[PDB]
Target: Papain-like protease nsp3
Amino acid sequence: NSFSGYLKLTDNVYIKNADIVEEAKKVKPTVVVNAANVYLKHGGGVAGALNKATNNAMQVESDDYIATNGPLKVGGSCVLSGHNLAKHCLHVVGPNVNKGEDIQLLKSAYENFNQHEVLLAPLLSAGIFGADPIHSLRVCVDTVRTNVYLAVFDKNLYDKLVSSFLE
Ligand SMILES: CC(C)[C@H](Nc1ncnc(N)c1Cl)c1ccc2c(c1)S(=O)(=O)CCC2
Model:
């Protein structure tokens, strides 16, 4: 958990302009969070980047989990191996508002982070999931009580999030 160069926003929420994959390699965190979908198909974006960094081992393990347990619910999670990136990967499904899922489930999604003391995570439901990223940060700050290190891979978005939170 050797996180470096983060800006502390609250007593338990930190943020950095960084690729979550690059952070996982440098930090070797106990838990890395994946911004998953309910069938754990890691086809692009954050999930695709994390899966590619495990040389597809995450996707094979995920298919085996789904075969035995069925899909997740929106707002839910599962703990699987972290492979070479972390001890564990916490796969969390935030709502995809571009597909009509309820934005209120973003609170349920962040609540899954409270079962782990320290996490490296992405900004849930941002990007192509369509949630307002400033709203996602506010729900993270209001809901997560354990120590969360957010990696946002876009300097422009990083700067807007820090400005909107320090207002
Ligand atoms: C807002 C983006 C800059 C951010 N991207 C990243 N943030 C950190 N490490 C990365 N490798 C990337 Cl790709 C982001 C955060 C959340 C989500 C996505 C994108 S998505 O479009 O893959 C859909 C699922 C939710």
Q: What stands out?
A: The pocket of A1AL1 is lined by residues 19-21, 35, 45-46, 49, 122-123, 125-129, 151-154, 157 (CB under 6 Å). The two ends are 30 Å apart (CA to CA).
